[PDB]
Structure 1
Amino acid sequence: GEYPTVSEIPVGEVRLYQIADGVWSHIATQSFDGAVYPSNGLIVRDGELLLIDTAWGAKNTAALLAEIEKQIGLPVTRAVSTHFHDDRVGGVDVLRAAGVATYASPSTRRLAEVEGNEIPTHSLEGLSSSGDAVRFGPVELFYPGAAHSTDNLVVYVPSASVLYGGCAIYELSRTSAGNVADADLAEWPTSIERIQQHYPEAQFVIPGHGLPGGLDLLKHTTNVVKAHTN
């Protein structure tokens, strides 16, 4: 409202939502565990376009690039995967084939390889330690520590005050913990606080899945994960 939900997007298709000038999110849907799950990403204008995360599938990522050209008309040249799970590196092959330079942290590339997922080409330097931040085009890449995964990153747009938290951040509609298989429930709460303390000026917070909001998503996630912990 007007952000597109799980309904409002047929499977295989992708839709864009402009959050600010030169800043969009791309919304896709996927069937897993017997439920249609939505999934968010980010598109940031870089003068060319910088992509954050795939659209959760080769077919969806192809629809993503197709939708970008239809409605933005600028070429995607770089892509970054926030962690190694298939909903973030799934479609990296399609991106690579189209001429996009794909990026990811050394940890993410390794864990993706071990898991047997698509491996981004380039290695992002300087995100090894908890609290590390780097500059990659119009965004700042930040590693808050282990949370949803030991390797998850969050993306911030200092030009639009947009904070893309990936799956490390739950939407408000989510009451319980999602996929915590490779998650660190012990370090998750500390990691969320690093984001809060490093990006207290975020206007719009984009979770990995669902509707966007404000910084209130952080302690909400903290409330969910801590409840799941017990």
Structure 2
Amino acid sequence: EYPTVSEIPVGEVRLYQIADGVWSHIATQSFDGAVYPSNGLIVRDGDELLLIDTAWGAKNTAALLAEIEKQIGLPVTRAVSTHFHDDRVGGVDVLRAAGVATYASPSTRRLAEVEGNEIPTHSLEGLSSSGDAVRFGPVELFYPGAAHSTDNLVVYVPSASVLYGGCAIYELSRTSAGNVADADLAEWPTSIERIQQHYPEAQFVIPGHGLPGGLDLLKHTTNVVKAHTNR
């Protein structure tokens, strides 16, 4: 039963094992009087944890580490932010203070710095060209090309067929485009095509926000992006 926007108060974080040593983390945040859910990933790396993305702010991210310290007991050693916006890097100073090594592509780090946002300390090399893939312990990092943002990465857990799409992939419940202020609408469908062509084997697909599904979430995102383009 995947945790939903309701059963999580803004300030709290729930974990949801997906497979052997793979969790999503689920948080909530208020924007413009509404409440939205947010997903990241946790991947066991021997006796320690890889974190993908913050829980959308300093308070939610301190809760996330406390919820990891109650429920799993292993130390987060590294974190990756999948793009430069506040829902992915907000909480990076909290991670750093606790001893977590924070990572992002040089492009994410430059865009975060221009935007004023928290800047992960470490640089991920070899992701500057669309279709680039690099190994990062128990996951592959993949730059599909510009989509939700010019810098957006996706993460694959070969051991488990878990594709974490971040904010480049929409949940089925989302039937209109969200925040596309920094998006490349022209390149978004091609970038999703590179994800399909690189990861046909994926069996679990986690959007940046809301429910996981199958690879149908890629075709869903393409349908929503194209409808928005033709507004």
Shared fold by TM > 0.5? yes
Unmatched tracts of structure 1, length 5 or more: none
**2:20 corresponds to:** 21
Deviation (angstroms), 1:34? 2.1
Deviation (angstroms), 1:33? 2.5
Alignment deviations for residues 101-158 of structure 1 (CA, whole Å, 9 cap, x no partner): 0000000000000000000000000000000000001000000000000000000000
- Taking the aligned partners of 2:26 and 2:196, their CA distance within structure 1 comes to 25
- Taking the aligned partners of 1:193 and 1:62, their CA distance within structure 2 comes to 36
Alignment deviations for residues 132-191 of structure 1 (CA, whole Å, 9 cap, x no partner): 000001000000000000000000000001000000000000000000000000000000
**1:43 corresponds to:** 42
Alignment deviations for residues 58-109 of structure 1 (CA, whole Å, 9 cap, x no partner): 0000000000010000000000000000000000000000000000000000
- Taking the aligned partners of 1:33 and 1:195, their CA distance within structure 2 comes to 32
- Taking the aligned partners of 1:33 and 1:208, their CA distance within structure 2 comes to 19
Q: How many residues align?
A: 229
Q: What aligned pairs does 1:1-230 form with structure 2 within 5 A after superposition?
A: 2-47=1-46, 48-230=48-230
- Taking the aligned partners of 1:166 and 1:42, their CA distance within structure 2 comes to 9
- Taking the aligned partners of 1:25 and 1:69, their CA distance within structure 2 comes to 15
- Taking the aligned partners of 1:218 and 1:51, their CA distance within structure 2 comes to 23
Q: Secondary structure at the match of 1:31?
A: strand
Deviates more, 1:33-42 or 1:122-131: 33-42
Deviation (angstroms), 1:199? 0.2
- Taking the aligned partners of 1:3 and 1:114, their CA distance within structure 2 comes to 35
Deviation (angstroms), 1:3? 0.3
Unmatched tracts of structure 2, length 5 or more: none
Deviation (angstroms), 1:31? 0.3
TM-score, with length taken from structure 1: 0.99
Deviation (angstroms), 1:35? 1.1
Q: Secondary structure at the match of 2:159?
A: coil
- Taking the aligned partners of 2:202 and 2:220, their CA distance within structure 1 comes to 16
Deviates more, 1:213-222 or 1:26-35: 26-35
Coordinate RMSD, CA, aligned: 0.4
- Taking the aligned partners of 1:150 and 1:111, their CA distance within structure 2 comes to 9
Deviation (angstroms), 1:207? 0.2
TM-score, with length taken from structure 2: 0.99
- Taking the aligned partners of 1:158 and 1:33, their CA distance within structure 2 comes to 38
